[PDB]
């Protein structure tokens, strides 16, 4: 059923083309258009793939795959899978059975992962320059309005807190990072807080050693019931009370005499940080479900009130306030910062880093070409094709910078004949090849490995499927 396969390959190629030009540290932006008419301008690939109007099953699948295990790297996986698909197509026209191409690609994947594992430069949490570089790596091309060397600082400072070593590996519980945003000034007004932050005259403000009530949950009778509900909570010794559902202002008065938030993604991290737990029904509420916060308080953002939970019990607590002008700015800042956090977190947790600019890529290709003749006939071609498909990334990376792809590919290929140039990659601003390690173009080995892995998996899935059937 070639007719069903070609459509899959076309879908993959379509998504590649969708995310292609976004790639690199000079990646152009895409303009997403909602059917409403509203729009979203962005560089980040994950966001695109999220808001993107997915058509094909294989497409939605591919997206589902590229996002699996770390926000970034998706870009790489997608484009790589696209290249592999195209080269697979080229191989298919030569009447080569898919089960051969798959096997070849698998071998190539193994050799690739060996290659990355071999090249990788071990790093530690102490090598902060590396962390900074890795942070700054993804931050390039984000169109963030400056403060890259400051946002990177915030990242490096952020990951440092959320880290504790039980044994050999620090348990960087990334999920403890709260992220909010507001307008005004610029991203220089961005700032960290140790505790979680959340965007009537009410209850008191500065609570020291605060117990925090975390709760997701004829008229006269209802009043009695509601007051009963409030008193129940009051009888547990709760300093500050948090909710998600709408609270009757009468209960606000009551409690004031004793916020409703909006999102549970905050209440989550609040429960994480404070040490308390959420309750579905206040009838079950106790005094141990209350979270401990050593110095809770509230502060004014230039245009708005904002809640601060400082002095949270848990050591691994952290939040960041984002600031800027337009929505696109603060959003791109958010997503970029997420990417940074991801990359750095993976660097820390894994403890290995490599050079960008496509050094690892041309190295992997270089290796594959050597290993290719050592196996059978038809597989060798698949492996070679795999290598080429990898080089495609360098080429596209060159394209997105306004450079001639082939020339730079050949240059790097020529340079990587020396053992001592295994870090050399493409300086896109300069235009010439350079040692990407000194320029702080560093990325987590785990990201590269995962990208390769997921792309391979995706393409093999594309090739393994012979036909598409409607079921029930």
């Amino acid at each position: 059923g070639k007719e069903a396969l070609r459509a899959n390959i076309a879908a993959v190629k379509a998504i590649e083309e969708a995310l292609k030009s976004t790639y690199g540290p000079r990646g152009m932006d895409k303009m997403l258009v909602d059917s409403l008419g509203d729009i979203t301008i962005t560089n980040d690939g994950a966001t695109i793939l999220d808001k993107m109007d997915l058509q094909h099953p294989t497409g939605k699948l591919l997206v589902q795959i590229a996002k699996g295990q770390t926000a970034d790297g998706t870009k790489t996986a997608v484009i790589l899978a696209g290249e592999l698909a195209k080269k697979a197509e080229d191989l298919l026209y030569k009447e080569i059975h898919p089960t051969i191409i798959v096997s070849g690609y698998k071998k190539a994947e193994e050799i690739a992962l060996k290659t990355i594992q071999e090249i990788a430069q071990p790093v530690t949490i102490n090598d902060t320059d590396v962390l900074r570089k890795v942070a700054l790596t993804s931050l390039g091309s984000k169109a963030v309005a400056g403060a890259r060397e400051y946002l990177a600082d915030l990242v490096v400072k952020a990951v440092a807190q959320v880290a504790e070593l039980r044994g050999d590996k620090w348990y960087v519980d990334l999920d403890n990072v709260q992220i909010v945003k507001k307008h005004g000034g610029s991203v220089n007004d961005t700032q960290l807080v140790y505790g979680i932050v959340v965007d009537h005259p009410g209850m008191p403000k500065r609570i020291e050693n605060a117990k925090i009530a975390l709760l997701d949950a004829f008229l006269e009778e209802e009043e009695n019931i509601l007051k009963e509900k409030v008193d129940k909570i009051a009888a547990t010794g709760a300093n500050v009370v948090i909710c998600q559902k709408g609270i009757d202002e009468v209960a606000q008065h009551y409690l004031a005499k004793k916020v409703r938030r909006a999102k549970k993604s905050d209440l989550e991290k609040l429960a994480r940080a404070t040490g308390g737990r959420v309750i579905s029904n206040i009838d079950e509420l106790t005094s141990q479900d209350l979270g401990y916060a050593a110095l809770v308080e509230e502060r004014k953002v230039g245009e708005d009130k904002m809640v601060f939970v400082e002095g949270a019990k848990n050591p691994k607590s952290v939040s960041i306030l984002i600031r800027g002008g337009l929505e696109r700015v603060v959003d791109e800042t958010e997503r970029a910062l997420r990417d940074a956090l991801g990359t750095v977190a993976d660097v820390i947790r894994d403890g290995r880093a490599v050079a960008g600019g496509g050094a690892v890529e041309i190295e992997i290709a270089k290796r594959l070409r050597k290993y290719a003749p050592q196996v059978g006939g038809k597989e060798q071609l698949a492996i070679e094709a795999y290598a080429n498909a990898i080089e495609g990334l360098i080429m596209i990376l060159a394209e997105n910078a306004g450079l001639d792809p082939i020339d730079k590919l050949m240059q790097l290929r020529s340079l990587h004949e020396n053992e001592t140039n295994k870090w050399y990659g493409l300086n896109l601003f300069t235009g010439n090849p350079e040692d990407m390690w000194k320029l702080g173009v560093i990325e987590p080995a785990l990201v590269k490995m995962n990208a390769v892995k997921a792309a391979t998996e995706a393409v093999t899935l594309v090739l393994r499927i012979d036909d598409i059937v409607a079921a029930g």
Binding site: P57, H97, P98, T99, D466, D467, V469, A471, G472
Partner: protein
């Protein structure tokens, strides 16, 4: 013409599952109309869940579903074959041969093949595991089923096979055909998270608990077990006897004549010491779902109150032992009362390897069951099909008329399995078949196709490629029935509900 349309319908359906055959069977993606998807190269899943269009195709689906119902292994093999039969029939229709003739020819061919299946079958030795003959067979078939689906290391696999063997020892047997009826209800697979696969272990039940008190007896030769629910107006008040109470409870338990006490709610140190003095094996608290399972086998009864207890509630087991399992001590119970199923502790280092091991054991068990039910093996890799084809041509020669061509056309269909099965391995669909014919007609009937290795094998038994007869005959049957039923239908008629 309508017949030809039906034929095309069934044929076109069969064309899809042509690629999903054997080890290298390509995937098929099922779109659950609810907005969900599931992909597989499994005949049953595909044929089942898929919403078929044409009636003839639906009938073929029906045949396949029956084929699956009778036995699990072969389903696609039947559909591909049916398609082949119809495809070979439509060539005889062009020879202007009436369908009924083809049908009878196919019937005769089927009967002869069915007769020839055992003639070409290699019967096995099932006379005990003392001898290890059965083990070698079980090892071959194990690897037959396991090889296609495992990427795990062989050393890890060998242990799993060892377990399955150890399982089969215990499982029942029907006498009439000198075979064994593996009741899969007599096998448990407890998926324990944490630990390597080699740490996995087989035993007739175990609670996965450590000895409550080291002084406590960690091994009991002749055991006696008790199940305890409660941990050790008209007003009722407890008499002021705190420790004496506990001691008396333990003495009552000792008085009943028990050597093991598996409390539901857990045991306190004082009770532990008393039990340790009496030399009783104490066990920590266990889940209700666990204890409920235990009592019925153990022939015991969950005692609500020891004061009212009685030896009627006393269970028993042949042996109990605190055994080390991957540096994790566990209480093992052996051969107690109604042994029922053999319990596997499956130590998976990850949910993937866990479910993978479980899956492997399941498939292996099912296949071994299928071969054990009918103790005759057939040379897989398409060898037996070719052999049958040769024999059926030889048999076709001795029949005359248009039926000589109908039988010969039955043979040409069988040979599509070797053809397709090799093609999946990327081998040339033609040269492979003629090479096979050459090797076959001039050599052993065991000449076949190793799809995994992607090569033609002179003897597939040596490569541990084995197929049960119970499956094959049924596949043949349902396939023949299907192709027949398709060919027998003249045309369509508009009806009223």
């Amino acid at each position: 013409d309508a017949l030809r349309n039906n034929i095309l319908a069934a044929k076109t359906l069969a064309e899809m599952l042509r690629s999903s055959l054997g080890p290298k069977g390509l995937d098929k993606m099922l779109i659950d109309s609810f907005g969900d998807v599931t992909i597989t190269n499994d005949g049953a899943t595909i044929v089942k869940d898929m919403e078929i269009q044409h009636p003839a195709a639906k009938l073929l689906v029906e045949a396949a579903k029956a084929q699956d119902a009778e036995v699990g292994d072969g389903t696609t093999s039947a559909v591909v074959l049916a398609g082949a039969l119809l495809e070979k029939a439509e060539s005889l229709l062009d020879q202007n041969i009436h369908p009924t003739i083809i049908i009878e020819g196919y019937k005769k061919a089927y009967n002869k093949a069915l007769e020839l299946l055992p003639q070409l079958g290699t019967r096995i030795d099932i006379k005990d595991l003392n001898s290890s003959v059965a083990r070698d067979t079980l090892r071959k078939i194990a690897f037959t089923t396991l090889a296609s689906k495992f990427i795990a290391e062989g050393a890890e696999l060998n242990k799993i096979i060892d377990m399955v063997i150890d399982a089969i020892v215990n499982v029942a047997e029907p006498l009439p055909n000198g075979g064994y009826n593996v009741s899969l209800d007599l096998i448990k697979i407890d998926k324990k998270k944490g630990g390597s696969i080699e740490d996995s272990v087989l035993v007739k039940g175990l609670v996965l608990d450590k000895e409550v008190v080291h002084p406590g007896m960690p091994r009991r030769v002749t055991k006696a077990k008790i199940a305890v629910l409660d941990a050790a107006e008209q007003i009722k008040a407890f008499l002021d006897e705190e420790s004496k109470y506990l001691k008396d409870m333990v003495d009552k338990l000792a008085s009943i004549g028990a050597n093991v006490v598996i409390c539901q709610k857990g045991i306190d140190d004082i009770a532990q010491h008393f039990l340790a003095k009496k030399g009783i094996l104490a066990v920590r608290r266990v889940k209700r779902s666990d204890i409920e399972k235990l009592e019925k086998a153990l022939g015991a009864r969950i005692i609500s109150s020891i004061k009212d207890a009685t030896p009627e509630d006393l269970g028993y087991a042949e042996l109990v032992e605190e055994r080390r399992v991957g540096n994790d001590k566990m209480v093992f119970i052996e051969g107690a009362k109604n042994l029922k199923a053999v319990n596997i502790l499956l130590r998976g280092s990850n949910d993937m390897a866990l479910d993978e091991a479980e899956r492997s054991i399941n498939d292996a068990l099912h296949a071994l069951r299928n071969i054990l039910l009918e103790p005759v093996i057939l040379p897989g890799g398409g060898a037996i099909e070719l052999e049958l084809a040769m024999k059926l041509r030889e048999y076709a020669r001795s029949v005359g008329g248009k039926e000589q061509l109908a039988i010969e056309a039955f043979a040409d269909a069988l040979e599509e399995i070797p053809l397709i099965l090799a093609e999946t391995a990327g081998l040339e669909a033609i040269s492979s078949l003629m090479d096979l014919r050459a090797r076959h007609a001039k050599g052993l009937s065991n000449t076949g196709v190793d799809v995994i290795g992607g090569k033609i094998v002179d003897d597939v038994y040596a490569l541990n490629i084995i197929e049960p007869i119970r499956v094959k005959s049924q596949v043949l049957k349902s396939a023949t029935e299907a192709a027949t039923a398709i060919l027998k239908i003249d045309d369509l008629i508009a009806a009223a509900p």
